[PDB]
Amino acid sequence: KVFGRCELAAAMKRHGLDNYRGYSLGNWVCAAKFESNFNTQATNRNTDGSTDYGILQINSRWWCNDGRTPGSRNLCNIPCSALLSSDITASVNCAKKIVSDGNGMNAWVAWRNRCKGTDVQAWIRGCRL
Ligand SMILES: [Cl-]
Ligand SMILES: [Cl-]
């Protein structure tokens, strides 16, 4: 599923992401835009053999099992394919675990490079929330 901007904002808010660990909703929408272009089916292979999955591009070396990343930890205890669903629940619950592990949203390279320090509220402006 390719989400609309406000559609995704509302879904993330419903799943408890607004101000989760102090990160306003606009941060999460900005990270999804630049990680996946709002596409739940996005995948990207990395040089170390890991693959990033779904709307928030969660990595198979630490967080989910895709059966082809040796030494995977599978800390969210989910098959990576579950992160590609049209229902973002699995991606949200896993991202809540990621953003709590110490480095905050810096775990998402695109958030660090393209959202951090910007006016992220612009990503939810105009939306009926
Ligand atoms: Cl915001
Ligand atoms: Cl933080």
UniProtKB/Swiss-Prot annotation:
Compartment(s) where it occurs, according to its Swiss-Prot or TrEMBL record: Secreted
Active site residues per record: 35, 52
GO terms of biological process kind: cell wall macromolecule catabolic process; defense response to bacterium; defense response to Gram-negative bacterium; defense response to Gram-positive bacterium; killing of cells of another organism
Pfam families associated with the record: Lys
Gene Ontology annotations for the cellular component aspect, listed alphabetically: cytoplasm; endoplasmic reticulum; extracellular space
Lineage: Eukaryota, Metazoa, Chordata, Craniata, Vertebrata
Tissue expression notes: In the egg white and polymorphonuclear leukocytes.
Annotated protein name in UniProt: Lysozyme C
